[PDB]
Structure formats: C-alpha cells, structure tokens
Design a protein around this nucleic acid. Structure first.
Ligand SMILES: [Mg+2]
Ligand SMILES: [Mg+2]
Ligand SMILES: [Mg+2]
Ligand SMILES: [Mg+2]
Ligand SMILES: [Mg+2]
Ligand SMILES: [Mg+2]
Ligand SMILES: [Mg+2]
Ligand SMILES: [Mg+2]
Ligand SMILES: [Mg+2]
Ligand SMILES: [Mg+2]
Ligand SMILES: [Mg+2]
Ligand SMILES: [Mg+2]
Ligand SMILES: [Mg+2]
Ligand SMILES: [Mg+2]
Ligand SMILES: [Mg+2]
Ligand SMILES: [Mg+2]
Ligand SMILES: [Mg+2]
Ligand SMILES: [Mg+2]
Ligand SMILES: [Mg+2]
Ligand SMILES: [Mg+2]
Ligand SMILES: [Mg+2]
Ligand SMILES: [Mg+2]
Ligand SMILES: [Mg+2]
Ligand SMILES: [Zn+2]
Lengths: 86, 129, 60, 104, 232, 155
RNA sequence: GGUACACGAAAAACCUUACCUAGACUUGACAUCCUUGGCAAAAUUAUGGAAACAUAAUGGAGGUUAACCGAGUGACAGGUGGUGCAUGGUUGUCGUCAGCUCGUGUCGUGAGAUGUUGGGUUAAGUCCCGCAACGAGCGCAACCCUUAUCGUUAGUUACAUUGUCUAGCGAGACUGCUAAUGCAAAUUGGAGGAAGGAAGGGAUGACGUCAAAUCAUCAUGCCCCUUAUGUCUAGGGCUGCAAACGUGCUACAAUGGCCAAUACAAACAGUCGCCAGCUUGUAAAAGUGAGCAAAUCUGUAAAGUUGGUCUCAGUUCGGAUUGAGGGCUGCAAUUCGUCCUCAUGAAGUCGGAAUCACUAGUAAUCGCGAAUCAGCUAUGUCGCGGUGAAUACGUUCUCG
RNA sequence: CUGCCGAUAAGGUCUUCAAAA
C-alpha cells in the first residue's frame, strides 16, 4: 500500500530513544505513545509500552514482528460476551 | 429551386435540404449512408413515413445535417424536417399530411428530476410500520 | 464548547490537513458552502433578505 | 489619425440581465457617436449555478429548497478605437453590477 | 402551515438586492459578505431612535458606498456633525483603512408605510410594558391614516408575560400574499422582554407595481424630498 | 371515483409484415428498455419458423395468437368468504393483449435454449392447439363454464 | 407510526468532536469596561519533550500608538450543561386539500343560526342562478420562471453541408369562430392552428391540529458549574457484535458473460484546478509537458450496430471472503482511506405470510456532471441527457 | 346480502382584563 519512495515511517522521537536505549545495556521498557511507528530492524530486542487508550501494554519485539506498525500488536477495545436481552 | 426544413425532437436540430432530381432519391444523413449512421434497426422507414404515403418517386435529393441527441431523437428531427421542407412544394400535400398529425412538434421532452424523488416521477419506497 | 473552536479555526494549525472551514457568520462546522463561506441555514436567511447579489429563487 | 489598439475585445458579464442590456445600449451609443465600426453586441450562453439547501433546521432532509445565480454574458469587439473613442470611453460610468473583461 | 419568506419570494423579479457587488474569488466572497452584515446590524441594533428603515451597501474592487435611509436623521447627524464622525470610525474599523468609504445618509419619505420602523416601534412598545392590544391598534390606525393598503401584524411570544405562549394577528384589508405583482414589504423584530422574547412580524401592502422591471426605482421615499448628504 | 376514461396511445402498424400486433408483442417481450434487442429476438424467430414450418410467418403467428385468444374473463368479487367469480365478455383490445402476455410468460419458462428458439417453439406449438398457453386458456374457460350461475350478478 | 431509520451529517484516520484515558492552564484560548505604558505578536531554528508547554536565539509588519502588544485590575468571559411542556426563529403533517372567518343586518330568552346550505359547472367556497341575506378578507385562479412554433436584433470563441445555435425584445391560444343545449355560467364536437379548452413541468402551501421537530445552526427567560460541566494537546472512540428491522447496490444469466472494431448526447465544472499529446509501466499511476480563467482548451459517454466465442453447467454465471505485491492523498492509512494487479471463488438457479412505486418521454433501464472534499466500497444526495414501454372495463370491495 | 371483528393505566394546561384611548 504505502508508497515506495516514501519508505517506512517512524516519528524519529521513537528512533532517537531506541538508538540511545540500544547502546545502554540495562534496557527497561520504553514508554512510547507512537502506535504509528513501523517496527525498524534496530528495534529488535527492545520492549515498548504502547498506549492502548487507557494503559501502556508491554510488547516484546522480536526478529519476526518486524515490518508492521507498533500499535498493531496491541488492542484498543474489548468484547468477550453478550447478554441475553429477554 | 431547393427547399429547406428544420425539425426538432429531444434537443436535436435538423437541416433538411430538398433538391429536385430524377435519378433516385439517394437518402443521405450527415454525409453518410443511412445504413451506417443509424443502427439500421429498421428506424430508416420512420423518417420516410411521410415521404412514402405521398411519394418518393420524385427522387428528392436529401441533404441532412443533424447535430445532437441520440439516434431515435435524430430520426424524429428529420421526419419533422422532411415535413417542413415538404410544406414549400405543393401546399396541397399539407392537408393530407396534417391529417395523420405528421406536421406537429411532438412537444415531448424529458422531465426534470425533483428533490426527494428518485427520478422525474418515481418516489422512494414508503414504509408504514 | 463553541467559542473556543471558532477562535481555533481562525488560528493557523501546525498541519495543513488540520485546517477545516467553519461558517463565518455563525460557528456551524458541517454543511458549509465554500462558494460563499456561509452554512446552509445562514445562507437561507441571507438569501431571503437580498444580501447576496443574484441569488434568486429557482423555477428551473 | 491613429489606432493604437487593434481588435479591442470588450466582454460583459453580470448577475442581472436588464442592467446588462442597458450597459450594452449605452456602450453602443457612445461608440457609434464616435467613428468606430461595431461588429455587434452578441449574446453568449449564461452560466447558471444552482445550490440546494435544506429548509428545515434539524430533520426532514426531503424538504429542500433551491436557489440560482445566473452569469449573463455578452461579447463586443471593437475594430479600431483611436483617442477620439478612448477619451470618450473614460466618461462612461458602468453600473457596478456589470463586469468588464477588457482584453486589449 | 409554513409560508415562504415574503421578501425572499419577490427578490430578483420585482425587488432589487440590498447589496450589489461582485467579488474576485471564493475567499474574497466570504469576507465581503460577513462584513456588510456587521455594518447593517450595527445601524439597526444601536442608533435605533432614528427609525432607520433600510441600509444598502455598494462595493467595487476597493471603494465602499453606503446608502442609509432614516426617518429622523438628526440623531445620526448629531450636534454640529458630531455623532457622524463617530459612526465613520466605526465603519472604517469593520471594513479596513485600506479602502475608501462614501457613506450617504438619505432622508426617507412616507416613513409610516415601512414594515421595518413599524416593527421597531412595536418592539419598543412591548418592551416598555405597554398593553399589547392598545399598542398594535394605535400603530394600525396611524399606518392606515398614512394612506396605504391593508397591514397584517402577527405578534407571537410569551404574550403579557404568560406561561403559555399565544399569538395575536390583526389584518385589515386586502393583503394578497400569493400575488407576485403586489408590493409587500416585510420585516421581523425581536422584542426583548423581561419574561422572554416576543416576535413581531409586519406585512404591509403598498399598492400594485404595474411597471415591469427589477425596480431600480425608489419605494416610498419619493413623495417628499429625499436628500441631505455626508457623501463626497 | 374517477369518472374519466383514459385515452389510448397509437398501436402503430408493424414495419415489416405490416401487422400492428407485431409491435405489441415486441413491447411485451421488452425487458431493460431495449427496443433494438427485442426486435432482433422476435424477428429471428420468424426466420426459424420459415426454416421449420415452410409457411408464411405472419400467417402462422396469427393462427397461433388467434387460437390462444380467450373469450370469457373471470373477475373476482368477494362478499363474505372467499370469492364467487363472475364471467364477463372481455373487449377485443384486451383479448389480443391478454393473449400476447400469456404467450410471452410461458415462453420465458420453457426448457429450450436461447429465447429465440424458446419463443419460436411456443408460437409454433400454439398453432396446433397443443401447448402451455392453450392450457391456460382452457383452464379459465372451464372455470367460467363451471361458474356460469353467478354470471348474472356482477355488481 | 403515517410525519424517525442513505435523518441532522453537502464527506468521523489527525482535524472535525460535542465522548473516554491521560499530560498541562486559571479574569483564562476569545471580549468589553475601567489607571497605565508600549522600543510586538507571528513564524522559524535549538534542548527537554507523546505533543501540550518550557527554557535560548533572527527580535522583527508597522506607527509612536492607529489596529494590536501588553502590565494592574475587579466587574466577569466561557458551557454542544438542563428545560422545544417557558419561548423567538425555522420546518414536517393533514394538504396545493378546498376550505377558515369577519363587518352590517335578521331569527332565537341562549349557546347559536343566516350568509358558506338548494339546483347546475369545475381541480377549486371557480362561476352562474335561487335564496333574510347584503358585502369583504385569507386561501383557489391569473400575474413569475421553464419547455413546445414563429418574427425581429446580433454573428464570435458559435455556425461556415449557411442558417442551426446561443439570449434580449416581441407575436402567438383568447372557448377567439362555428354546431348542439342551457336563463347564465358552462359542457361536448368540428374548423384552422406548433400548441384547445388549467398545452406539460416548477416556485407559490389559508385559519389551524398533533403542548408534532429543533436550547446541538443562531438568539433567548430561568436553573446549574466558576483553579471546572471552562481551556490546550497526544492516544483511543464515534467503525464494536450472539442478534432484529428500514432504505439501496450487486446478483442468481444466453433479452447474457468475455474479446475486437465502432456511431450518436445534454447539462455542469475547472488555475493549489481541468489536464490534451508524448515516454515508462500487466495496471492503478509517474515523468515530461503544451492549451485553457474558458460557446476557443480539458473532463475517453454507456446502453446501441456488426463480427468471433461460450452452449445452460453452480458454469467463461455470481462476486463475497481471504493471502501477497504495487499506486495516490496526506505528518500519519494498525485501530479506520480508497484504486490497480495477481491468487481464492461464500451464498445465490427468481425468493414464504405480506407488501411498495408509477398514468409518457412516465415506469424500467444506460451512462454523464456538480455540491461538501487533501483522500474516501456515496452503491448516498442534487441535477443532465440516450433507449423507452404496459394498462385504466369500473367504484362492488380497500385506505385517506 | 348477510364469516368473523375484543380491548386501549392515573392526574393534568390554555385565557390574561377593560379600566380606555
Ligand atoms: Mg452554541
Ligand atoms: Mg412523527
Ligand atoms: Mg477526534
Ligand atoms: Mg519597535
Ligand atoms: Mg506612547
Ligand atoms: Mg446555556
Ligand atoms: Mg412544540
Ligand atoms: Mg338559505
Ligand atoms: Mg349563496
Ligand atoms: Mg397560485
Ligand atoms: Mg413534546
Ligand atoms: Mg483523536
Ligand atoms: Mg455511522
Ligand atoms: Mg438510490
Ligand atoms: Mg454475445
Ligand atoms: Mg475549435
Ligand atoms: Mg449453490
Ligand atoms: Mg462473476
Ligand atoms: Mg489499511
Ligand atoms: Mg437456471
Ligand atoms: Mg396520475
Ligand atoms: Mg436496476
Ligand atoms: Mg373469521
Ligand atoms: Zn452559518
């Protein structure tokens, strides 16, 4: 879908923290509000706290989850059972 | 001594040129063979409907210029155009042509779409319950 | 919450796609005529007073 | 004698019709009072725009009225003008409504 | 049932437009359109003791012309042309210093048979605690004596401070609303009362216009003289 | 509640066999507002009729349609329960019209192939009083004959 | 309920947005009045930042404060917060149905009656007669627009197969003439006429009913909040899902599917746009790039005609769903944009009880354009043209 | 030309006024 010339997309605020956080050995969960950032190869090995709307759900990225958007691996709404009307 | 007629139907003009000749009428529409300008779906007789019952042996050379409309509308324009040219050669013909009502503008055009309606006269489905 | 949105619309946003068009007389956001910058229910009042030259009732 | 302007193509347009005819009468009278061969005040097709507006404030989309705004248009091309016409052209005073498209 | 606006039904056929201008683009068509409404509203809301009947606006690429008709122009003029300077500064701030203004007060004739000042007088009377029945009747009788045709006054609202809203009408003569050739002048006003809002609607019949034309001719300003100035 | 009788539009003489009735059946088989398509379909069936029956197509069409034409018409009239029917003599204009409608309706349901052959078979099958349109005409005639008693009372 | 359900909304990714979670603000994002100065707000580059916002920078048009930029400052600003059963305004409905009343007079102890009901004629309380009624107002009709023929003016950017076409004015149709019967309105037929008896369509909608709809277009009485029900920003939500209904689209097919060639429109729109041609690409599209501020240039007309093929199959029908690769808009397409290409090929073979619309260019159907719009499964809405029917015997039943 | 055909929660607005012009 997304054009070629444009490429991928990160907010570059997430990119800067990831570069800083990968150099630092004692990595901790990275609190990012950017559900819009696509997972870049360098992201591999870090863990993020994506804002589902209410809380920050923790996602551990792998060498496989690479390519999709960072908010795609977290939910936003919840539905598990209806209730008999009558 | 040529004759000229101007018919119209569904926003379609017509310029019919009546030329006296004695070497077959050679019907012609917009510089093209009638069998090719029209789907030749037997629509050709219609335009000649007032030129048949009186005569076509007088071999009137027809020079038709029609610009607008579809193809039945163009055909309607030239019949009136043929009849309007016919009203300059032997005013008696008029009488018999008037009879069959072949000397009247059809006055029938597509109506305007109305708001709240799915067309000229259609209307949405009504649900009571 | 009307007055604050009106003022914000006049102010330029930080993104081009963030700019929307709101009626200039009232503050209605939806159903705004870009040809006149006037919403559908202010255009009726203005048209019925003669303020817009040439907008006459239609017979088609 | 001179010209200084060949093929002066005056174009007229206005929201109103009667004013447009009046301006053409005034323009023609002055330009024929001087020595100019007017081609003729021809009419052009009027561009009509129509806007549909719902009458009701809240509900009943079905009841919607309509408005129109006609852009009546005329054309007028002057062959040779010269100062004798141009200087007299300064005192014409065209009623606001009529709009000019002088193309030189 | 609901009726089409009487003024709006006769626009472009027998009635001219209150604002006559052609803008450059769709962006400049909106600025030039809200601004004239402010000017008209200014004249009407404040400066009311003058009986301003109608204010017309005329604009070109950059030159603004205002034609203001009033029944008592002394209040606009002021003491040795004082209030006049004030209003000029008002008008200049709304449109802009970069343009040229040519405001023109023009005194009006036959002030009575105009639905605007009658509605304003009606609204003032209701706000002044004047009994409604007496107020309309005095206005009705004075208008008829002025020498016009039938007048229709509808005064709907929280009548006399009541808790249930009513409406009182008083037609007196032929008011042909369905006819296009008739000269019906219409105006509506909001009387702001301590118990709410009162809506007054005045329909006036000022004869039949038997001369075809989109007006371009005055309307009930001709009988007495009509001049004064402040123009250039 | 109307008190006015509707006008009638012209029927037009056919453009080939000069038998008005051809134009009517053309309009009957019309679907999707295609005048062109309908003429082609119908005209092709007469050519198939030539290839098969070796006779004049107009004569065969009249012999089929004239044979299908009914005589009695049963109008529903309910009073208390169900409807007691009433046989009435149908006008000549409606006689041809009803015949054409049935011809088309049973033609677009036959097990045959392209509607050209479908419609061609129905007309040739109706010239010998043995088909689907015949059975419909037979059924209404027998129903009217059975309900002969109430013919006197109409309304 | 009819008079809600492709409705407000003529465009919910952000914005819109009024909702939730969070991070921030308090005469406030916006305004006036007052003591008081103006020697700025912007925009943008840095750092911290989810962004609000902070700390530093070029210190900014101008015109000496005009507007605004401020300080001080309390009255206050602000509310899409409640009440459409307090309202103004606007609208739906009976209904474009033919009604609703008043003045004077008369009758009646009185509510009230009369006119407005009788007989003819209409779409009409339209008109004529009769008549204790005589008149009048609103509605009805006509005056307004548009389509149908012609005359006149004008001839480019139309035409240029020479009088189309476009838009100004005017003529024309007036039951005007005749036949029948009626007191008279008036009905029917005929003549001539492009048009005949409201020639087709539109705008035009009486008093009032339903305490009908809207405080969320706007305005407003009253009540309520006032470091919060006000304000800014980021993310989510308005797009959910065991289900039911309404309105539409696509189909279940040879009156058709696919391929090739090809003829004929009207209206509207266009300089952050319409985009011709050319080059690349299986294609959406990209690059180059003229032309057009427009009767000039651009926005491919499709059904339709001919030829080839399928040969009645759950198929060369039907396109859903799903996977992958691409293009465009936009900071941004996962929640939640659409287009193209490839891959797959749900249901569905005419649909139960019961229901809806329509009386000619109408129903049915085929395309085209515009509005809001950066983009949008708008198949919606408002318009334009191409083809183009069937039926109306009658008021017994049915609804109003 | 006589089939069949039953029901519909409670309390409620609305006339303020002619003194008169
Ligand atoms: Mg508001
Ligand atoms: Mg309802
Ligand atoms: Mg939002
Ligand atoms: Mg300075
Ligand atoms: Mg100073
Ligand atoms: Mg409030
Ligand atoms: Mg209400
Ligand atoms: Mg009587
Ligand atoms: Mg009477
Ligand atoms: Mg009328
Ligand atoms: Mg209510
Ligand atoms: Mg959001
Ligand atoms: Mg929705
Ligand atoms: Mg639809
Ligand atoms: Mg085929
Ligand atoms: Mg050209
Ligand atoms: Mg199956
Ligand atoms: Mg398919
Ligand atoms: Mg997506
Ligand atoms: Mg089958
Ligand atoms: Mg009908
Ligand atoms: Mg269809
Ligand atoms: Mg029963
Ligand atoms: Zn508005």
């Amino acid at each position: 879908s997304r054009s070629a010339k444009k490429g991928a997309f990160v907010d570059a605020h997430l990119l800067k923290k990831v570069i800083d956080m990968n150099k630092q050995e004692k990595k901790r969960p990275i609190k990012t509000w950017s559900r819009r950032s696509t997972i870049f190869p360098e992201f591999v090995g870090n863990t993020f706290a994506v804002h589902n709307g209410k809380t920050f759900i923790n996602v551990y990225v792998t060498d496989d989850m690479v390519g999709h958007k960072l908010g795609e691996f977290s939910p936003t709404r919840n539905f598990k059972q209806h209730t008999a009307n009558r | 001594q040529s004759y000229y007629g101007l018919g119209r139907r569904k926003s379609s003009s017509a310029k019919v040129y009546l030329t006296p000749t004695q070497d077959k009428g050679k019907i012609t529409v917009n510089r093209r063979d009638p069998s090719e300008y029209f789907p030749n779906k037997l629509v050709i007789q219609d335009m000649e409907q007032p030129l048949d019952l009186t005569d076509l042996k007088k071999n009137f050379d027809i020079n038709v210029v029609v610009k607008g409309g579809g193809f039945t509308g163009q055909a309607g324009a030239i019949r009136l155009g043929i009849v309007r040219a016919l009203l300059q050669f032997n005013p008696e013909l008029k009488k018999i042509l008037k009879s069959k009502k072949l000397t009247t503008r059809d006055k029938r055009v597509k109506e305007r779409k109305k708001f709240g309606l799915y067309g000229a006269r259609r209307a949405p489905q009504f649900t009571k319950r | 919450a009307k007055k604050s949105l009106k003022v914000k619309q006049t102010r330029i946003p930080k993104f081009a796609v963030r700019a929307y068009t709101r009626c200039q007389r009232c503050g209605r956001a939806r159903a705004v005529l870009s040809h006149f910058g006037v919403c559908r229910l202010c255009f009726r009042e203005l048209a019925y007073a003669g303020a817009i030259p040439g907008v006459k009732k239609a017979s088609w | 004698n001179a010209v200084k302007y060949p093929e002066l193509k005056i174009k007229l347009e206005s929201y109103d019709s009667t004013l447009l005819d009046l301006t053409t009468k005034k323009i023609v009278e002055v330009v024929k009072g001087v020595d100019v061969k007017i081609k003729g005040p021809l009419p052009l097709p009027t561009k009509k725009e129509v806007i549909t507006i719902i009458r009701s404030p809240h509900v009943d989309k079905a009841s919607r009225e309509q408005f129109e705004k006609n852009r009546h248009k005329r054309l007028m091309i002057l062959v040779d003008v010269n100062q004798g016409a141009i200087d007299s052209l300064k005192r014409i005073k065209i009623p606001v409504g009529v709009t000019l498209r002088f193309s030189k | 049932g609901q009726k089409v606006n009487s003024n709006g039904l006769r626009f472009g056929i027998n009635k001219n437009w209150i604002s006559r201008w052609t803008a450059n683009s769709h962006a400049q068509t909106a600025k030039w359109l809200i601004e004239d409404e402010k000017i008209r509203n200014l004249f009407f809301v404040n400066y009311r003791n003058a009986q301003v009947s109608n204010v017309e606006i005329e604009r070109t690429q950059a030159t603004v012309d205002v034609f203001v008709y009033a029944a008592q122009p002394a209040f606009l003029i002021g003491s040795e042309n004082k209030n006049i300077q004030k209003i000029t500064k008002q008008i200049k701030q709304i449109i802009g210093r970069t343009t040229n203004l040519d405001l023109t007060i023009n005194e009006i004739g036959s002030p009575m048979l105009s639905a605007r000042i009658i509605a304003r007088d009606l609204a003032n009377a209701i706000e002044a605690r004047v009994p409604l029945r007496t107020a309309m009747r005095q206005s009705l009788i004075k208008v008829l004596k002025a020498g016009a045709n039938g007048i229709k006054v509808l005064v709907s609202g929280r009548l006399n401070g009541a808790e249930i809203a009513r409406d009182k009408m008083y037609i007196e003569g032929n008011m042909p609303l369905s006819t296009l050739r008739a000269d019906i002048d219409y105006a509506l006003e909001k009387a702001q009362t301590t118990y709410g809002v009162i809506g007054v609607k005045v329909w006036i019949n000022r004869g039949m216009i038997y001369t075809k034309g989109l007006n371009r001719t005055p309307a009930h300003i001709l009988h007495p003289q009509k001049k004064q100035p402040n123009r250039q | 509640m109307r008190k006015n009788r509707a006008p009638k539009r012209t029927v037009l003489p056919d453009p080939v066999f000069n038998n008005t009735l051809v134009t009517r059946i053309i309009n009957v088989i019309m679907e999707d507002g295609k005048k062109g398509l309908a003429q082609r379909i119908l005209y092709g069936a007469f050519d198939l009729i030539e290839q098969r029956t070796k006779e004049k197509p107009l004569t065969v069409f009249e012999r089929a349609v004239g044979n299908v034409m009914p005589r009695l018409e049963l109008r529903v009239r309910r009073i208390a329960g169900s409807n007691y029917q009433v046989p009435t003599e149908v006008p000549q204009d409606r006689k041809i019209a009803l015949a054409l409608r049935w011809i088309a309706m049973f033609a677009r349901k036959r097990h045959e192939k392209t509607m050209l052959e479908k419609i061609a078979n129905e007309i040739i099958d109706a010239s010998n009083n043995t088909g689907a349109a015949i059975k419909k005409k037979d059924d209404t005639h027998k129903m009217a004959e059975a309900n002969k008693a109430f013919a006197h009372m109409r309304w």
